[PDB]
């Protein structure tokens, strides 16, 4: 249903510039329809090309940028997938993945892994942390997909996946004014610029903590052989009820009852138990996904003050302590931070 | 439901002295270093369209024909679904382009050059390729006393294919499988079947688009043959205007109002040709039902005589027009 | 969210040879007993508008002026929010009404009678009452060589009130408390404050609406002074047309295209008068902010000299027009 | 937000042709905002005029008919309210009620009455039954307000109230073709007619049973001193869960557990226990309110066949037996039927 602004708003049938694949399915992603995997009929003289794994992912076209370029690709760098390219078909969109796993390499979806092989787990955390490192401090991001990043992973690699996210370039005009929203060529800048917002300290902290929670949710998903309900961004779903069901950390009320979760291998204990109120505020920050443009309601949210300011600062510092102990738990380094 | 996040400020000042009557035409000039008055002579028009006109490659469709660009710049930029073709311009001191809309242009030579530009623009369209306009039954543009600058056009491309007996001779590499070996192995471009008769339909279509554009240019009144709306019916418009006096098969455009001196009968195309033209045009509503109009104009629904003589009448109009402006008949 | 139930079949055939270019004008004739050819001479036009134009009494606003109806029938009927003014017509055998749109009318007398009809139609509007058009800067209608038939107009009425020292003399019964004793005791009509200066604004408004209508009638081209859209700005249109030669305070309508013989300068109203007219008109977007434009045209924002001389120039245009068509200056 | 179809779809501010009463409240209808009551400052020389009760009710404008005339008024006849008239203000609408209760008459809202004074109760049932009698057999109606009719009632009268309903004129073209959808004057009929539908036996039975259930729900509300949840037409609300909570009639599974309800005076017993599946099908029929035009989904619904046809017929006949015993319970007469 598309119309023009002339004296007759004509109904336009959404044109289909690409045969939509009828056999839509990915065995690595059985629960996902938009996820489709497939192995091409490579030149059969060469057994090597047999390994080439190809996965297309479906998604809306809004996720493309002003340049018609999909947002996660901006954060992509030194990618591991053998190749990638975008696919625009009307509102729908597709994103095919060329991969060539080595003679024995075998990827698999991060979801529901449970995997306790901290070597592979650390491979994935390195991939995701380096990827999100491409984010700028005054640039921020939300993930309308879920509260984590999808990916697959083999013993040799951890291939990232396309994400339903939205870039948002905030701008903190430092009092000492000595990347700008008006980066076009001067003529074009005369008309318009990025749909920027007002950056500030609190927004920086909010986005940083948000990406950190994304990291931790992905880590959970990796070490959860059961459902990791944290991903769920359902409108009806509320974190209040979520932690009411899950309860709080037995070892300390402050944190969540993540000690009792179901783990593919060794349970780590109350290690996976983050403070609760920080998670709550994180979910509130995440709710931004539905109205990204209205930034005043979510930009500083994780770092906002509910004295209330003292409690917010203290509990954010508690979450920072949690990140410190987490990094120590995996021998990590905050140079990415 | 999700908010369609906007990655840029939507330009509110929808002001185009070239095209005020529209809701998407905005022209505006730079305010750069004035030591160079020519830099001030620069002009900058952005038009707001819909992203649906972006192909698989994320390419605005009419840009497939932006070849030998006489204008300065043409770049695409979008605010979510909204899209924006942004134009750089720089005429010489006395050169100033103007809207084709009801231009009333009397200068024969200016019309000649403009029509040459439009015909060459549309020429590169492939034989099995078919174009459909989505805003008006005439290509839109501007024109200065010296040169002409095409304007962005909202249209959809489509590729066709046939299986002629001699399916080998000539360049057959142009196929709707325009991906790279694995990616084509995954999916192929949307495509249809092309055959000579729909090609004649398309020829008639493009030529009458050219005719509509020239009418608009030389008209000191509106061009009723330029509206692609629904309630508009070629039947009612014909009833309004009627058969042309010296040739009733034609239409009474002789009485119309041109800024240039009225040539009279010269601008009077046939009747059933325009009928089938309009019915072919109303296809655009749902191109996916392509066959419902793929062949419409030249269909044999005897009727063989009727449609072939209709083609004869159309090509008679084509040749007499071309001669009327010195155009070679071989410019098709 | 509830479905806006439709109590009638929505008439799909939006066909009006009188007004094809619009999306709501449908005309059509009866197919009744043909033994009476005059019954066939009957014509039947329904226009589709929005129910918002129905008052408290559920009365279509412009119908307040459907007095001494020269047309046959005018009834209202709605399909939920959609509304439908349905017209009966029956000209004499050779009488046939036509669209005011770009009528190019040369016949002076026909124009005279049409303008008489329009002025009398608008005359009954009360002094403290103010009208606002919602579709165009000109009253819409049709006209036969003999008579004229107004067409439905989408406009909002509003009543005003003042507290002059002599708040007793004359007929003061007309108040915005137009309910019956208890029902008025419950609620009152929406109302505003009327004062002489906004009344002058309204006089200028209505008169320039009349001027736009006459231009449309005698124009063999469109009437750019008839569009109430947003991006349209009187500033840009003025820049396009410019100061009239024999009187630069006026506008260069002399060069415009009339189906009747161009009178030239005769149709050239002042400049700032049209400016303030347009700014007054753009009020209609949100009438509830009434004061933001209630006084606009005749505001004293010295400026006393400026606005009073603007009124003088406007009334000069009014009188010279009236004399140009024999109209008495007392027909205001 | 209103636009025209010309080359510029202009945003139009909804014009306000009437001061909306700021003190919006009815003491007889404390839970209803659209309900407002008020006593006018009558000529104080006459104590008689003091009794005059005036109640305006707010509602959407869609409820008006093609003639801009509100639907319940069509069913109104020999009305008891001292006077009535409609009030169009933009989309909003109002409906003022003039009443002159006699020197001692005292009206009151039917809701939450509990009243056991079968004399007054029978007054109300007579009012409602005679009112709904104005419905034609081939004409049908739905009540988007709720699953009943609002009203007030004094010892002397039972004043009806405006309803958010929608008239629907079906048409059963009897094979022996010897009120028509095309009732306009011939010219106008040449363009259009009523938005009719295809009547039939089953639709007649469905509408009849629907109005009967409306009667019974109103009677319940009258004899319920507590909430009568049956009125509720909430989208989230399902009759399945409703009767799951309420359970079925202890005296017979067939019916509903209406024996246990809360009654202003004497409980009547399992008398108020209707068959359940009939109520279910009634609620499904009622769901039509949201898309009245699409009649194929609801018109025959109460009388439709789920053998399944045998069960539907049998259980509808059981509901008819329930109406028979109900009428006997109040000495009524089916001449209205």
Author numbering:
A (entry chain B), D (entry chain B): 7 to 184, 190 to 317, 335 to 365
B (entry chain A), C (entry chain A): 17 to 317, 335 to 365
What does the paper say about this structure?
The most well-studied baculovirus is Autographa californica multiple nucleopolyhedrovirus (AcMNPV). Baculoviruses have their large circular dsDNA genome packaged into an enveloped rod-shaped nucleocapsid. The BV nucleocapsid structure consists of three parts, a central helical sheath containing the viral genome, an apical cap and a basal structure attached to both extremities of the helical sheath. Herein, we report high-resolution cryo-electron microscopy (cryo-EM) structures of the BV nucleocapsid combined with de novo modeling and Alphafold predictions.
The innermost and lowest portion of the apical cap was identified as having C2 symmetry. Like the anchor complex, the C2 plug structure also consists of two sub-assemblies. First and intriguingly, the peripheral part is composed again of Ac101/Ac144 modular assemblies, as in the apical and basal anchor-2 rings, and in the C7 plug. In total, it is composed of eight such Ac101/Ac144 modules, of which four are unique. The latter are almost identical to each other with very slight variations, thus the peripheral part of the C2 plug can be considered as arranged in a pseudo-C8 ring. Interestingly, each Ac54 dimer binds both dsDNA strands through ‘echelon’ arrangement along the two DNA helices. While all the four protomers use Arg255 and Arg308 for dsDNA interactions, only protomer-1 also involves N-terminal residues, Arg45 and Arg47. Sequence alignment of Ac54 analogs from 28 other Alphabaculoviruses showed that both the Arg255/Arg308 and Arg45/Arg47 tandems are strictly conserved suggesting a conserved way of DNA binding amongst baculoviruses. Our observation of the Ac54/DNA complex being located at the apex of the filled nucleocapsid suggests that it plays a key role in the regulation of genome packaging.
